[PDB]
Amino acid sequence: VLNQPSSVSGSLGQRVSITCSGSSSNVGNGYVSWYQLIPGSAPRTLIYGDTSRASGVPDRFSGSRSGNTATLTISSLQAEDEADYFCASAEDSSSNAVFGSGTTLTVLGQPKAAPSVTLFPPSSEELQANKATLVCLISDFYPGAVTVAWKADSSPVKAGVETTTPSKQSNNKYAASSYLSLTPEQWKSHRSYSCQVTHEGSTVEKTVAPTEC
Amino acid sequence: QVQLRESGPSLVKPSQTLSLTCTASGFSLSDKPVGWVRQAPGKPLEWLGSIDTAENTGYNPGLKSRLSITKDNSKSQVSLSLSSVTTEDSATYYCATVHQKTRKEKSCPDGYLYSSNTGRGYDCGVWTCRRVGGEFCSATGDWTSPSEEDFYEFYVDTWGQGLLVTVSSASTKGPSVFPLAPSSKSTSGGTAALGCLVKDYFPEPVTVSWNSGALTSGVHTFPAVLQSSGLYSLSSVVTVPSSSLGTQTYICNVNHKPSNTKVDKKVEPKSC
């Protein structure tokens, strides 16, 4: 496996570089490739033959190699460049490919945004199926690091909680979701339930009550 | 246009042989070599194998004893087989057109170039690796013979879409779709958020659209959580006008191909 940095970060409009270190039998042979993997889409070939730009790739992407170390350089860093990046090389055969450990690229400089939080109580249908699920959706926030807590009445509750990792939307802001799995009896006993989303020191709390509909 | 589509099971029991098929489009298999690449959750890309125009196959060494790749130019298909699968083989599998080429070249060491002239320009006659700057034609430290070297060229041209394969002894389960209707206190001014909760399905993936793809403004299908039961749950949300609640109907279209299930759930407004 070709050693790459686990995660790098750059600023919008700036220039960033990602290294790919191997040995004399692969990257030293002198034919390194680079691929961009955006969450959801198919892998995209960026560079082949150390320096050759792939078809349709913009000129902002550049490839270089020094000895046993290749480098992918992205100039004029755009927001759509947030992705994983992998290097690859043949080794002792044109059919024996070895990939790199991958590098996650984080693009900085985008506007900050407080999260919009929506707390759905258990639907009537789900309660009629002897199940209760409190859903807490968190949309339109940046940076993509939030922390969710759950309150039964006003006490903290931790059992039955499942929270997703923030993932980017089509508008390039981050989104996350949290679930509190309750039996209908637990949903009826307490007077209220609350979802607390903490983002950059601010805490937005939404609350639903079983007394309402 | 060159396309490659993967097909096969979304779920395979441990110890079984995962078999996948790649349908090629826009080119002849007798022209471009076709290979397979997988990625496990949180793991790097991993090479599997390839078959070229001359039907010769080449595999990842560490997996060669379990891999078999065949090709049919007539049906224009490429088949992959991985035996004795385990949970470590749960991954996304792509097929793709790959460039492979061996180059049986001649090579000179560093500081030496293939020439028949010294640094000053005196014609030595014989072509050989001569030291850059050297002034003698046959001095020991001014020449060496060309060494035959093989240079390997590899890259991945066009990637397929990617098929998610899950290896587990647990059985398939279809999803249960519940509504996430916005109440009067849940709105956000002129707009409101409403969605669908897709509970308890296995295995992944599940895709959700809204109003048969006609409603795209604000749609976001969240990642799935794995509950302690081994089943997945997912949510999808869409932003609609608050004034239209009660008038315009909204329906989420959930698709779970691993179980051949499609659910169109109508999210009706809360009366409060």
Pairwise CA distance, residues B152 & A28, whole Å: 11
The three-point CA angle B164-B169-B174 to 5° equals 60
Tokens of B222: 């969240």
> Is the CB of residue B176 less than 8 Å away from at least one CB of chain A?
yes
Q: What is the 3-state secondary structure (H, E, C) of B175-221?
A: CEEEEECCCCCCCECCEEEEEEEEEEEECCCCEEEECCCCCCCCCEE
Superfamily of domain A7-108: Immunoglobulins (2.60.40.10)
Closest partner residue to B154 (CB to CB) among A97, A118, A135 is A97
Tokens of A172: 């390039």
Q: Euclidean distance between the first and final Cα of chain B, in Å?
A: 53
Instruction: Please state, as a whole number, how many other Cβ atoms lie within 10 Å of the Cβ of residue A120.
Output: 27
Coil/strand/helix, residue A68: coil
- Chain B residues with CB-CB distance to A46 below 8 A: none
- Which of A44, A32, A31, A43 shows the shortest CA–CA distance to A4? A32
Structure obtained using:
X-ray
Tokens of B94: 């792509």
Closest partner residue to A99 (CB to CB) among B46, B58, B270 is B46
Instruction: Please state, as a whole number, how many other Cβ atoms lie within 10 Å of the Cβ of residue B35.
Output: 29
Instruction: Determine whether A13 is exposed, middle or buried from the number of CB atoms within 10 Å of its CB (0-12, 13-18, 19+).
Output: exposed
Superfamily of domain B176-267: Immunoglobulins (2.60.40.10)
CATH topology agreement for domains B3-104+151-167 and B176-267: yes
Judge: A176–B222 Cβ closer than 8 Å, yes or no.
Answer: yes
Residue with tokens 């042979």: A29
- Which of B180, B176, B115, B165 shows the shortest CA–CA distance to B144? B115
A177: left (phi over 0), alpha (psi -120 to 50) or beta: beta
Q: Answer yes or no: are the C-beta atoms of A65 and A52 closer than 8 Å.
A: no
Query: In chain A, where does the domain assigned CATH 2.60.40.10 lie?
Result: 7-108, 116-208
- Chain B residues with CB-CB distance to A120 below 8 A: 180-181, 186, 195, 197
Tokens of B102: 């061996």
Coil/strand/helix, residue A146: coil
Alpha-carbon distances of B56 from A94, B33, B68, B183, B268, rounded to whole Å:
12, 10, 12, 63, 58
Which residues, in sequence order, are CB contacts of B258 under 8 Å at separation 6+?
B10, B11, B166, B172, B201, B202, B203, B204, B205
Judge: B45–A99 Cβ closer than 8 Å, yes or no.
Answer: yes
Q: Where are the domains of chain B?
A: 3-104+151-167, 109-145, 176-267
Judge: A165–B223 Cβ closer than 8 Å, yes or no.
Answer: yes
DSSP A91-120: -SSTT-EEEB--EEEEEE-PPPBPPEEEEE
Instruction: Please state, as a whole number, how many other Cβ atoms lie within 10 Å of the Cβ of residue B28.
Output: 10
Judge: B45–A139 Cβ closer than 8 Å, yes or no.
Answer: no
Instruction: Determine whether B163 is exposed, middle or buried from the number of CB atoms within 10 Å of its CB (0-12, 13-18, 19+).
Output: buried
Exposure letters A161-187 (e unless 16+ CB within 10 A, then b): bbbbebbbbeeebbbbbbbbbbebebb
DSSP B61-113: GGGGGGEEEEEETTTTEEEEEE-S--GGG-EEEEEEEEEEEEEEEEE--TTEE
- Which of A39, A56, A44, A63 shows the shortest CA–CA distance to A164? A39
Q: Round the CA-based radius of gyration of chain A to a whole number and report it.
A: 23
Instruction: Determine whether A158 is exposed, middle or buried from the number of CB atoms within 10 Å of its CB (0-12, 13-18, 19+).
Output: exposed
A140 min Cα distance to partner chain B (Å): 10
Q: Which helix (H) or strand (E) holds A69?
A: strand A69-74
Coil/strand/helix, residue A77: coil
B3-104+151-167 adopts what CATH topology? Immunoglobulin-like (2.60.40)
> Is the CB of residue B87 less than 8 Å away from at least one CB of chain A?
no
Residue of B nearest to A88 (CA): B155
Instruction: Determine whether B236 is exposed, middle or buried from the number of CB atoms within 10 Å of its CB (0-12, 13-18, 19+).
Output: buried
CB pairs below 8 Å between A and B: how many? 161
Q: Answer yes or no: are the C-beta atoms of B264 and B177 closer than 8 Å.
A: no
Judge: B58–A93 Cβ closer than 8 Å, yes or no.
Answer: yes
Residue type, A26: N
Q: Answer yes or no: are the C-beta atoms of B152 and A31 closer than 8 Å.
A: yes
Longest dimension (CA), chain A: 71
- Which of A79, A68, A91 shows the shortest CA–CA distance to A174? A79
DSSP label at A2? B
Resolution in angstroms, to 1 decimal, for this deposition?
A: 2.3
> Is the CB of residue B21 less than 8 Å away from at least one CB of chain A?
no
B246 min Cα distance to partner chain A (Å): 16
Pick the CATH number of A116-208 from 2.60.40.10, 1.10.3430.10, 2.120.10.70, 2.160.10.10: 2.60.40.10
Closest partner residue to B272 (CB to CB) among A35, A45, A213 is A213
Q: Alpha-carbon torsion B241, B246, B248, B251, what sign?
A: positive
Q: How are strands ordered across the β-sheet holding B67-72?
A: B3-7, B18-25, B77-82, B67-72
| Number of helical H runs and strand E runs in chain B | 0, 22
Q: Answer yes or no: are the C-beta atoms of B157 and B97 closer than 8 Å.
A: yes
Pairwise CA distance, residues A79 & A171, whole Å: 11
Pairwise CA distance, residues B232 & B176, whole Å: 11
Pairwise CA distance, residues A190 & B175, whole Å: 29
Which residues, in sequence order, are CB contacts of B229 under 8 Å at separation 6+?
B200
Pairwise CA distance, residues B208 & B178, whole Å: 13
- In this structure, chain B runs to a length of 272
**Exposure on the CB side of residue B267, measured as CA atoms within 13 A:** 31
Tokens of B260: 């051949």
Residue with tokens 């009660």: B246
Pairwise CA distance, residues A157 & A155, whole Å: 7
Tokens of B158: 């066009």
Q: Answer yes or no: are the C-beta atoms of B245 and B269 closer than 8 Å.
A: yes
Q: Answer yes or no: are the C-beta atoms of A64 and A74 closer than 8 Å.
A: no
Q: Answer yes or no: are the C-beta atoms of B67 and B59 closer than 8 Å.
A: yes
Which residues, in sequence order, are CB contacts of B257 under 8 Å at separation 6+?
B10, B205
Longest dimension (CA), chain B: 98
Pairwise CA distance, residues A82 & A100, whole Å: 18
